[PDB]
Amino acid sequence: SGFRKMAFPSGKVEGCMVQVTCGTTTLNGLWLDDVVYCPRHVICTSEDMLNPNYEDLLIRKSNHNFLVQAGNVQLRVIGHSMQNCVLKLKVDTANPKTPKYKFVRIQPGQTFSVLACYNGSPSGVYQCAMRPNFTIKGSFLNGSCGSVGFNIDYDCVSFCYMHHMELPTGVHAGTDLEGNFYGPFVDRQIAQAAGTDTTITVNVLAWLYAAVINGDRWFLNRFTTTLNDFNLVAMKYNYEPLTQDHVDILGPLSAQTGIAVLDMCASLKELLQNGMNGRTILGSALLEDEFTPFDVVRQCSGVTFQ
Amino acid sequence: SGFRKMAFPSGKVEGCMVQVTCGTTTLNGLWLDDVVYCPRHVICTSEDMLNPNYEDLLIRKSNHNFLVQAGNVQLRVIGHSMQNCVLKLKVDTANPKTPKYKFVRIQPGQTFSVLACYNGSPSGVYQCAMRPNFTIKGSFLNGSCGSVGFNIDYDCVSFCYMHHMELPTGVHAGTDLEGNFYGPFVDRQIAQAAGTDTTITVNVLAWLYAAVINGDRWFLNRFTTTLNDFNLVAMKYNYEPLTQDHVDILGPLSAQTGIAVLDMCASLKELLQNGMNGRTILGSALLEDEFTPFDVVRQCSGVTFQ
Ligand SMILES: *C(=N)[C@H](C[C@@H]1CCNC1=O)NC(=O)[C@@H]1Cc2ccccc2CN1C(=O)[C@@H](NC(=O)C(F)(F)F)C(C)(C)C
Ligand SMILES: *C(=N)[C@H](C[C@@H]1CCNC1=O)NC(=O)[C@@H]1Cc2ccccc2CN1C(=O)[C@@H](NC(=O)C(F)(F)F)C(C)(C)C
Ligand code: NA
Ligand code: NA
């Protein structure tokens, strides 16, 4: 029993974190085989942040302008290139702790673990979602750039996020590991603002299923709804549309609990219209939307507390 | 910016997790140097759970009745002993990944990270507090026993919890790493029930300070309170007494924000009496009490967003 915001074990990623310095800027890099990946803005200077010409800035650098430190060992940079908004620094040493890994670009609504790092040293691990507006509600300070987000499947680390920017609302923007930003954001000091966000409907439903699995039914009702009618209510409450593919993805949780997806939708509709009335679900007074269906299956019992 | 339930990086603990089997019971152990620590109830059988005589059960076992597996390597048990409610299995191999470590018995209100494991394999990491009633609100299933809770300071892992039991309310009970239970709980299948819990006042205050650091002041007021008068309100809301030592511990957060501790107490008093009025603090609609003052200092900026 219980249900927590649960991150993946971070050890396989900890062994990949290094420190990268260029000029007076220090941030984190990801060391996989003989390449260190880091945000390209490591090459910027303070008076040229509004519209850096990264190609022009980088051609002016040599390999020895980049200092890479793994623990208390210096790695020598022997090549470099820019790919989108990341730098790839070829080093003289392959990381002996390189895990089995993939690079993945995730869809909005998917979750991942973040290993927050400073000066190449891991600080903490927490769970986040890619918001529909392609920001993440992270926890990041100066020096955190190059920290990565990831999922683990069996023994394979799927890296999906590298940290680059904080927006004025205190939320975060970054790239996949090929250096492509999520969302419309750029590595420039310009007016950027998160678009209006929405609630991840399929995740709220998954979490209601988690609550049932763990033994709570107070929020259920005898009603059902059509998908179309549910989506009319979703829109009114700033919830993402629920698609038939979402309904299919919720199949296993529906089967384990005996609650049809559209019946759980009627429960959610009533919660949106009436509120919780001072009650909680899985210890929360808000409807939680940063657990995917997969996250629920991963954490919860395969047997419902009936 | 941001503020998340943040666990410690788990890699140093992952390298210590092993699987322990006795009879038909399999659970997790902690492998440090040449000793594997695990719950003593690994030696129980299903028809003798009401009042096992552990001394009598253990004298009937030999070293070779215990199977220890680290990854896909079998470790040979070469000695065993019972200390309180843990078993210490001496093995033929010292763990080469043994971190710098300590065993600590924590006080109620302190937090720690849990590496949930099954069959010796880490599953996930989350943050918990030792509740005032000496339960923890964990997330644990069959096979999770022997999973550990820990804090990390510099390079030193302080182990403080090993998982043993789930109580009828779905909360969890376990021991320090010397095998002493937290709370009145025992490793017997008998009517046990968590005592009435209380809210960890000093932690709620720390988290209100976190909210101010991150730029939110909506809940402050112009009032102050005496410690005695605050504690009269705390008691009414099932909050732990705030001691002068708690006030001293909140000193650094008070200094960083410019809000006297007793002034923050007046803010909290008003929140308890009036509620949040539909507003949130750091994304929560409830008053959060599983961040210590240290946790806030560890995660938050040293500079307040004024
Ligand atoms: C990486 N170390 C750092 C992480 C930030 C610092 C505070 N919290 C975080 O998450 N990233 C930056 O400081 C980036 C780097 C950068 C590259 C190119 C041009 C300008 C910058 C300045 N950075 C910002 O995140 C700034 N944000 C913005 O300019 C915008 F809001 F995204 F537009 C700022 C936080 C104001 C420094
Ligand atoms: C460890 N693998 C397991 C963890 C449990 C299983 C479900 N969620 C958990 O956290 N621990 C047990 O199953 C223990 C072991 C034990 C030792 C001696 C005597 C009896 C048991 C049975 N266990 C329980 O946790 C049971 N709880 C209680 O008996 C009590 F509520 F604590 F009193 C029970 C969950 C009913 C199996
Ligand atoms: Na329903
Ligand atoms: Na006040």
Instruction: Please spell the DSSP secondary structure of B159-212, one letter per residue.
Output: EEEEEEEE-TTS-EEEE-TTSPBSTT--SSSS---PPPP-B-HHHHHHHHHHHH
End-to-end Cα separation, chain B, in angstroms: 13
Beta-sheet strands, E only, within chain B = 17-22, 25-32, 35-39, 66-70, 73-75, 77-83, 86-91, 100-103, 111-118, 121-129, 148-153, 156-166, 172-175
Distance of CA A184 to the CA centre of its chain: 16
Angle at A21 between CA A18 and CA A22, to 5 degrees: 145
Q: Do B5 and A126 touch (CB under 8 A)?
A: yes
* Residue B77 to residue B69: CA distance in whole angstroms: 10
The two tokens of residue B84 are 């309180």
Among B residues 122-181, those touching chain A with beta carbons less than 8 Å apart: 122-128, 137-142, 166, 170-172
Considering every ligand atom shown, identify the ligand nearest to the alpha carbon of residue A262 and give its number. 3
Question: Are residues B127 and B183 in contact, defined by beta-carbon separation less than 8 angstroms?
Answer: no
Question: Are residues A66 and A202 in contact, defined by beta-carbon separation less than 8 angstroms?
Answer: no
Distance of CA B19 to the CA centre of its chain: 22
Question: Which residue is closest in CA terms to ligand 1's atom 21?
Answer: A189
Question: Are residues A188 and A50 in contact, defined by beta-carbon separation less than 8 angstroms?
Answer: yes
Question: Which residue is closest in CA terms to ligand 2's atom 28?
Answer: B189
* Residue A233 to residue A41: CA distance in whole angstroms: 43
Question: Are residues A133 and A197 in contact, defined by beta-carbon separation less than 8 angstroms?
Answer: yes
The two tokens of residue B34 are 């040449």
Go through chain B and tell me how many residues it has.
Answer: 306
CA distances from B66 to A133, B75, B87, B95, B285 (A): 53, 10, 11, 18, 48
- Residue A43 beta carbon below 6 angstroms from any ligand 1 atom: no
Q: Which domain holds residue B224?
A: 201-301
Among A residues 82-121, those touching chain B with beta carbons less than 8 Å apart: 115-116
In what helix (H) or strand (E) does residue B251 lie, and over which residues does it extend?
helix B251-257
Four-CA torsion B254, B258, B263, B269, nearest 10 degrees: -70
Q: How was this structure determined?
A: X-ray
Strand order in the sheet with A86-91: A73-75, A66-70, A17-22, A25-32, A35-39, A86-91, A77-83
* Residue A243 to residue A231: CA distance in whole angstroms: 9
Q: What amino acid positions of B are annotated as catalytic residues?
A: 41, 145
Select from A91, A103, A117, A95 the least CA-distant residue to A178.
Answer: A103
* Residue B205 to residue A231: CA distance in whole angstroms: 40
Considering only alpha carbons, which residue of chain A is nearest residue B303?
A: A141
Question: Are residues A102 and A155 in contact, defined by beta-carbon separation less than 8 angstroms?
Answer: no
* Residue A163 to residue A165: CA distance in whole angstroms: 7
* Residue A208 to residue A199: CA distance in whole angstroms: 14
Structure's resolution in angstroms: 1.5
Beta carbons within 10 angstroms of residue B115's beta carbon: 27
**How many residue contacts between A and B have a Cβ separation below 8 Å?**
122
- Residue B206 beta carbon below 6 angstroms from any ligand 2 atom: no
SS (H, E, C) chain A: CCCCCCECCCHHHHCCEEEEEECCEEEEEEEECCEEEEEHHHHCCHHHCCCCCHHHHHHCCCHHHEEEEECCEEECEEEEEEECCEEEEEECCCCCCCCEEEECCCCCCCEEEEEEEECCEEEEEEEEECCCCCCECCCCCCCCCCCEEEEEECCEEEEEEEEEEECCCCCEEEECCCCCECCCCCCCCCCCCCCCCCECHHHHHHHHHHHHHCCCCCCCCCCCCCHHHHHHHHHHCCECCCCHHHHHHCHHHHHHHCCCHHHHHHHHHHHHHHCCCCCCECCECCCCCCCCHHHHHHHCCCCCCC
Catalytic residue flag (residue A44): no
* Residue A251 to residue A206: CA distance in whole angstroms: 10
Question: Are residues A125 and B9 in contact, defined by beta-carbon separation less than 8 angstroms?
Answer: yes
CATH code, domain with A231? 1.10.1840.10
- Residue B96 beta carbon below 6 angstroms from any ligand 2 atom: no
Under DSSP, is residue B18 helix (H, G, I), strand (E, B) or coil?
strand
Go through chain A and tell me how many residues it has.
Answer: 306
What atom of ligand 1 comes closest to residue A138's alpha carbon?
10
